[PDB]
Design a protein around this ligand. Structure first.
Ligand SMILES: CC(=O)N[C@@H]1[C@@H](O)[C@H](O[C@@H]2O[C@H](CO)[C@H](O)[C@H](O)[C@H]2O[C@@H]2O[C@@H](C)[C@@H](O)[C@@H](O)[C@@H]2O)[C@@H](CO)O[C@H]1O
Ligand code: A2G
Length: 586
């Protein structure tokens, strides 16, 4: 094994920072990115505490579909990355880069990435120490003849160079199962047997109408735990709102896939945090997002989604490393072996831990994410683990998994009920993670959580998550309900029929919308109420280190009832929020 070019794990997580090549401007002789970011500009803007954990992911987007175009663009940007000089110190500090080398089956009619050979990739790895890895993304919808053979070569060349091969894929049409050899294409399976320590596998939650979120994430987790991948994560995509046909927030009716560029702007900001929690809480450590202009920003500026949600979330997972593989292994009670493709795909988990077929969220943390691997693989490396002896490894074909009811009945024996209320909650050490799991329905949710004898009741509007940590002198609270008002995008439409018929915003229009109405002149949403009730408190708690999104919250309101040893905390807010309550138990 060659020395890894970087570490990627719970203590060293990774945020991919996508930059998408502007092919129209390339045709005009210019080297630029859609949304106006520049390689150097964007890197400099990345907060210094985040720099060791972020990598620039170049994507060839709509570069010309002919030989040389992607090589020429990529070489230009690699040169820029390599030669970067930190203006503060004057020293040459090469920017870490990942290249997107495979997408849309690398079809010559889909992507300029077709004309990027393994030999050229090897050459770049040897020429650029700052090239940390290569990226394959979204071929589930065009599963090319030799995709497995090519993935084997990408993993091998990455290992040869100590770089990572990162593959982001969703289990549509059995994609994850096929990747590991289900249909007899086994080159990647054999590659993985040798080179798994250089592989990252990620979900890509884009094609949301097919409902493969829970199953893909279960695979990513299980592949990791069973040593088929070095780490895992997810690419969370605001385009899910388009794929599922949604429009104005909470509005009734479905418009199908008809207003793409309005639709990818509409997902509530805080909901990206709710999706990301499913990665973190289950030991994942790699994060990436689309649409880049909404989730990250434009013109080397951070969008509010990035500044108020993703940045703050990512800082949290650095400060509190995800559960290690050893830890997750110890907590795992059930591990599924087999193909979700013949057990209803996403339907497998509906009314088990998801509330509907098309969602990226969970309705309970009781089982967290049940890990799994495709039937084609073996559980050998799993069983060889010291931490895996208390795990039940079960075939997906077992009678215990044959219906919704049998699953719940089986899982409930092994995963005890550990909170009350129709709301998402999962516990890790001294921390309760809570979120309202409604996607597009304006319904409050409530839960009752305990820290031993201390009772905490919460009431959350949709698109709200919290992290409640029992500390020695009280309770640390992180809250996020940041949701701006996107109604202006759906102006002039009073119903689904009129919305479907709006003029297209277009790619360029949506980028301009961001510049003119999101980066500035933002239509912030209304402040909204969160309630926390603590029972078993001695005296009126005190509040410390209160901060959050500028102008986004009223002072929290504490109402202590001596007789009943309890406090009611009312928060009115829209953004990220943080404070500590100090108190003693009664
Ligand atoms: C030929 C064709 O139309 N292919 C579609 C893909 O391009 C789509 O992928 C992503 O989908 C969203 C809409 O949900 C949007 O069109 C994105 O541009 C697209 O993502 C880009 O293209 C991919 C091929 C990847 O290279 C990705 O990194 C890019 O950002 C899928 C959605 O499931 O539908 C196909 O039909
Ligand atoms: C056809 C089309 O518009 N494709 C675009 C692609 O070019 C890129 O901008 C992507 C980012 O999420 O979203 C989509």
């Amino acid at each position: 094994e060659v020395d890894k070019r970087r570490e990627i794990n719970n203590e060293h997580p990774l945020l991919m920072m996508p930059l998408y090549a502007n092919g129209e401007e390339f045709n005009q002789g210019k080297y630029t990115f859609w949304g106006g970011d520049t390689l150097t500009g964007k890197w400099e803007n990345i907060p210094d505490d985040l720099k060791p954990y972020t990598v620039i992911q170049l994507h060839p987007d709509d570069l010309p579909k002919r030989d040389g175009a992607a090589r020429d663009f990529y070489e230009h940007m690699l040169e820029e990355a390599a030669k970067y000089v930190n203006p503060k110190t004057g020293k040459n500090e090469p920017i870490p880069v990942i290249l997107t080398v495979y997408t849309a089956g690398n079809m010559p009619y889909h992507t300029s990435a077709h004309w990027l050979s393994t030999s050229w990739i090897d050459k770049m790895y040897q020429k650029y120490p700052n090239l940390h890895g290569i990226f394959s993304t979204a071929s589930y919808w065009i599963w090319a003849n030799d995709i497995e053979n090519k993935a084997a070569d990408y993993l091998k060349v990455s290992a040869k160079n100590g770089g990572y091969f990162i593959w982001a894929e969703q289990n549509s049409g059995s994609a994850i199962e096929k990747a590991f050899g289900k249909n007899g294409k086994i080159a990647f399976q054999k590659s993985v047997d040798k080179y798994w320590k250089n592989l990252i596998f990620m979900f890509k939650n884009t094609p949301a109408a097919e409902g493969n979120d829970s199953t893909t994430e279960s695979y990513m987790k299980g592949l990791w735990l069973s040593n088929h991948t070095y780490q895992w994560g997810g690419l969370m995509d605001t385009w899910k709102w388009y794929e599922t046909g949604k429009w104005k927030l909470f509005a009734s009716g479905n418009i199908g896939k008809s207003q793409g560029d309005r639709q990818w702007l509409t997902e509530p900001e805080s909901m990206l945090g709710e999706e990301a929690l499913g990665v973190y809480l289950n030991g994942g450590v790699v994060y990436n997002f689309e649409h880049p202009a909404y989730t990250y920003g434009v013109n080397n500026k951070e969008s509010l989604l990035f500044s108020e949600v993703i940045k703050e979330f990512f800082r949290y997972v650095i400060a509190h490393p995800a559960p290690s593989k050893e830890k997750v292994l110890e907590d795992t009670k059930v591990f599924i072996h087999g193909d979700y493709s013949n057990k209803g795909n996403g339907k497998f988990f509906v009314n088990v831990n998801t509330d509907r077929e098309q969602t990226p969220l969970y309705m309970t943390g009781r089982y967290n994410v049940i890990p799994a691997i495709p039937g084609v693989l073996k559980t050998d490396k799993l069983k060889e683990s010291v931490s895996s002896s208390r795990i039940q490894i079960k075939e997906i074909t077992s009678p215990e998994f044959s219906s919704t009811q049998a699953r719940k009945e089986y899982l409930n024996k092994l995963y005890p009920m550990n909170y009350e209320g129709d709301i998402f909650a999962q516990k890790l050490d001294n921390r309760w993670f809570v979120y309202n799991y409604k996607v597009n329905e304006n319904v409050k949710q409530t839960g009752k959580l305990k820290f031993n004898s201390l009772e905490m009741n919460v009431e959350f509007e949709p698109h709200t998550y919290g992290i409640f940590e029992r500390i020695s002198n009280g309770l640390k609270v992180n809250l996020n309900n940041f949701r701006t008002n996107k109604d202006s995008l759906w102006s002039n439409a009073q119903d689904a029929n009129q919305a479907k018929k709006l003029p297209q915003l277009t790619k360029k229009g949506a980028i301009k919308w961001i510049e003119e109405h999101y980066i500035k002149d933002t239509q912030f949403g209304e402040k909204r109420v969160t309630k926390i009730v603590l029972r078993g408190i001695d005296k009126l708690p005190t509040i410390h280190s209160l901060s959050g999104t500028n102008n986004s919250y009223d002072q929290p309101s504490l109402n202590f009832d001596q007789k009943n040893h309890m406090v009611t905390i009312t928060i009115n807010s829209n953004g990220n929020l943080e404070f500590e309550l100090h108190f003693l138990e009664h």
